[PDB]
Amino acid sequence: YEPIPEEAA
Amino acid sequence: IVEGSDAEIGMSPWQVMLFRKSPQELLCGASLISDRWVLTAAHCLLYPPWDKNFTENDLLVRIGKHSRTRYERNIEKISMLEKIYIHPRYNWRENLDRDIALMKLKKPVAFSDYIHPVCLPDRETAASLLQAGYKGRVTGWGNLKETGQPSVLQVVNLPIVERPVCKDSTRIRITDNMFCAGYKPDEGKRGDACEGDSGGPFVMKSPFNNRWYQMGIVSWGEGCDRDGKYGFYTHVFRLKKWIQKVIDQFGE
Amino acid sequence: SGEADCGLRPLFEKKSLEDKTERELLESYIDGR
Numbered sequence: 001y002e003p004i005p006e007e008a009a
Numbered sequence: 010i011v012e013g014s015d016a017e018i019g020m021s022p023w024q025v026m027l028f029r030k031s032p033q034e035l036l037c038g039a040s041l042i043s044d045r046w047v048l049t050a051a052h053c054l055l056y057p058p059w060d061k062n063f064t065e066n067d068l069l070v071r072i073g074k075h076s077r078t079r080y081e082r083n084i085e086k087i088s089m090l091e092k093i094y095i096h097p098r099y100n101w102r103e104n105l106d107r108d109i110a111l112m113k114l115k116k117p118v119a120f121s122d123y124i125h126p127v128c129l130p131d132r133e134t135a136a137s138l139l140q141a142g143y144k145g146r147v148t149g150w151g152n153l154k155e156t157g158q159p160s161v162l163q164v165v166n167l168p169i170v171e172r173p174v175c176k177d178s179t180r181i182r183i184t185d186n187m188f189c190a191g192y193k194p195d196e197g198k199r200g201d202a203c204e205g206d207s208g209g210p211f212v213m214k215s216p217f218n219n220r221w222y223q224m225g226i227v228s229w230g231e232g233c234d235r236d237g238k239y240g241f242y243t244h245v246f247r248l249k250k251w252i253q254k255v256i257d258q259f260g261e
Numbered sequence: 262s263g264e265a266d267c268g269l270r271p272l273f274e275k276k277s278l279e280d281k282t283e284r285e286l287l288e289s290y291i292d293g294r
Contacts, residue, residue: 001033002080004069008087019272020280043264122271128263144289166285214286216293221268 010149010163011234012200018075021148022125023223024162026071027053027208036063038149038209039112040223041072041126044119045260047112048252050208050226050243051099054110058101065090070114073123075162077150084123088114094255096248106184108228108243111255127212127223134222135246138213141171145190145213145224147240151206155233158205165200167191170239178239179231186247188225189239201240203233211242 016024025047027036039049047070054063070088074081092113100106118124130138144166153159167190175189183189190211192198202209211225225242232238273280287293 001035001078003033004080004087008080009069009089014282017272017280019270022270120266120271125269125271126264126267128267131262134262138290142289144286146286164282166282168289214283214293216287216290219269219274219294221270221274223263 010147010151010159010165010200010206011153011155011203013163013165015159016075016148016162016164019122020164021162021210021212022073022123023127023221024074024148024209026074026150028069028071030067030069035077035150035205036068037205037207038151038227039070040210041118041124042129042223043126043261044117045114046256047114048223048226049110049112050108050228051095051110052101052105052108052228053208054093055095055099056101065093070112072118073121075123077158077160077162086118086124088116088118091115092259094259096251104181104184105229106186107248109226109245109248109251111252113260127210127221129249129252130222130224130246132246134215135224137217138215138222139169139188139224139246141169143213144168145211147202147206147209147211147227149202149206149209149227152203152233155203155235167200167240175239175241178237183241186244187228187241188244189241190225191239194236199234201230201234202227
């Protein structure tokens with residue numbers, strides 16, 4: 001699972 | 010999904026992923042019903058026999074997805090939860106009767122080609138489509154096998170089965186809040202929901218207004234694709250006032 | 262019902278395009294619309 005960009009949250 | 014196919018792009022725009030923050034992980038499916046409300050199964054959040062009990066914080070909602078595993082760089086939208094509501098008479102102690110829960114997002118989500126809500130049935134819609142023999146559609150990123158993980162969102166079309174037949178396949182007590190779906194061993198054609206699919210939608214397309222309607226919530230089954238066995242779903246039209254009521258009291 | 266522009270897909274219903282297996286559902290409601 002690719003991590004989610006702190007800039008999406 | 011067991012014996013399903015990969016979904017087309019924008020095929021199920023209400024499809025939602027229930028995602029664990031850490032360990033970052035696929036919890037269950039869910040469905041978007043407006044820009045601030047999500048619908049799922051109560052057992053995805055609370056299951057005391059297994060010590061399962063998630064709060065707002067433990068979770069993340071991911072909308073507009075196609076790939077299971079990849080961050081979908083300008084497609085998907087991630088939302089945070091404002092509040093969780095479970096049916097007050099959800100029966101976890103015995104047959105998962107009333108397996109339903111609402112989720113109120115912190116901020117309204119914007120629709121797009123890949124993001125769009127499904128309709129909630131009215132009494133008349135329920136009345137003409139919820140019939141033995143009529144087929145509905147299930148989607149999810151769950152197991153492909155009873156006992157791996159698909160790459161893209163899967164889809165399967167299944168028939169509603171007669172109550173007696175449902176009743177006759179298990180030792181569990183079935184309620185009016187449930188409906189079962191699947192192919193018979195005679196019919197030799199198959200498919201089912203599987204682990205990780207739980208809580209997504211069972212939808213139907215109305216022939217009268219050519220609109221998509223959510224009739225069921227993937228609820229429970231014994232095994233995945235077992236002959237002589239069926240999938241059970243939460244009967245959404247029967248829980249409509251409860252839904253109507255929480256949105257009335259706490260939102261929109 | 263569900264919502265308001267509810268259940269009409271921007272890539273199908275909106276453009277009058279069908280998905281690859283929706284005809285299987287409609288023929289079971291003993292041929293749709």
